[PDB]
């Protein structure tokens, strides 16, 4: 079995910015979600080999996780907050698509998403 390469976290041709919203996404949103009790399954790319989920990357073609998001924020990969917010939403949606409703992992993602949305409705301006 084989995992795909992780999503891109470095690209010298991609334009970058450090905005107040992106700083907030790292300092408040990511920081808070990362230390949540249910963060651990989302702190790295889904390891389909280790978890014995050989169909995962057949079903999920746009993988995302908070480890990748953390790298993107810390290494100034983004041009804007929308890109980052989309990464969070992709992470949640992938989880809901792949896993059965009411699976533990889904309940965990839902708890993180609830927190995420509370933090996001208080972003600074752009
Ligand atoms: C986000 N994850 C990570 C993951 C983790 C695991 S897990 O680590 O076995 N696990 C199951 C119970 O909930 C806690 C996490 C199983 C499947 C996945 N897949 C399919 C994902 O969607």
UniProtKB/Swiss-Prot annotation:
Annotated disease: Cornelia de Lange syndrome 6: A form of Cornelia de Lange syndrome, a clinically heterogeneous developmental disorder associated with malformations affecting multiple systems. It is characterized by facial dysmorphisms, abnormal hands and feet, growth delay, cognitive retardation, hirsutism, gastroesophageal dysfunction and cardiac, ophthalmologic and genitourinary anomalies. CDLS6 inheritance is autosomal dominant.
UniProt source species: Homo sapiens
Post-translational modification (record): Phosphorylation by CK2 disrupt the intramolecular binding between the bromo domain 2 and the NPS region and promotes binding between the NPS and the BID regions, leading to activate the protein and promote binding to acetylated histones. In absence of phosphorylation, BRD4 does not localize to p53/TP53 target gene promoters, phosphorylation promoting recruitment to p53/TP53 target promoters.
Any further remark recorded for this protein: JQ1, a thieno-triazolo-1,4-diazepine derivative, and I-BET, a benzodiazepine derivative, have been tested on tumors with success. Treatment with GSK1210151A (I-BET151, a I-BET derivative) has strong effets on mixed lineage leukemia and promotes myeloid differentiation and leukemia stem-cell depletion.
Signal sequence bounds: none
Cross-link (Glycyl lysine isopeptide (Lys-Gly) (interchain with G-Cter in SUMO2)), chain numbering: 58
Protein's gene: BRD4
Tissue specificity statement from the Swiss-Prot or TrEMBL entry: Ubiquitously expressed.
Subunit structure: Interacts with p53/TP53; the interaction is direct. Interacts (via CTD region) with CDK9 and CCNT1, acting as an associated component of P-TEFb complex. Interacts with RELA (when acetylated at 'Lys-310'). Interacts (via NET domain) with NSD3, CHD4, BICRA and ATAD5. The interaction with BICRA bridges BRD4 to the GBAF complex. Interacts (via NET domain) with JMJD6 (via JmjC and N-terminal domains); the interaction is stronger in presence of ssRNA and recruits JMJD6 on distal enhancers. Interacts with NSD3. Interacts with NIPBL. (Microbial infection) Interacts with bovine papillomavirus type 1 regulatory protein E2. This interactions may serve for the tethering of viral genomes to host mitotic chromosomes allowing successful partitioning of the viral genome during cell division.
Family designation: Belongs to the BET family.
Protein location: Nucleus; Chromosome
Name of the protein: Bromodomain-containing protein 4
Domain notes: The NET domain mediates interaction with a number of chromatin proteins involved in transcription regulation (NSD3, JMJD6, CHD4, GLTSCR1 and ATAD5).
Site (Acetylated histone binding): 99
Domain Bromo: 17-123
Known role: Chromatin reader protein that recognizes and binds acetylated histones and plays a key role in transmission of epigenetic memory across cell divisions and transcription regulation. Remains associated with acetylated chromatin throughout the entire cell cycle and provides epigenetic memory for postmitotic G1 gene transcription by preserving acetylated chromatin status and maintaining high-order chromatin structure. During interphase, plays a key role in regulating the transcription of signal-inducible genes by associating with the P-TEFb complex and recruiting it to promoters.
């Amino acid at each position: 079995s084989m995992n795909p390469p992780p999503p891109e976290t470095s690209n010298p041709n991609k334009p970058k910015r450090q905005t107040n919203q992106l700083q907030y996404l790292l300092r408040v949103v990511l920081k808070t979600l990362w230390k949540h009790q249910f963060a651990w399954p989302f702190q790295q790319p889904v390891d389909a080999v280790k978890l014995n989920l050989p169909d995962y990357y057949k079903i999920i073609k746009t993988p995302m996780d908070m480890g990748t998001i953390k790298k993107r924020l810390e290494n100034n990969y983004y041009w804007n907050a929308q890109e980052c917010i989309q990464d969070f939403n992709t992470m949640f949606t992938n989880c809901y698509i792949y896993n059965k409703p009411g699976d533990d992992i889904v309940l965990m993602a839902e708890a993180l998403e609830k927190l995420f949305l509370q933090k996001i409705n208080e972003l600074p301006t752009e």
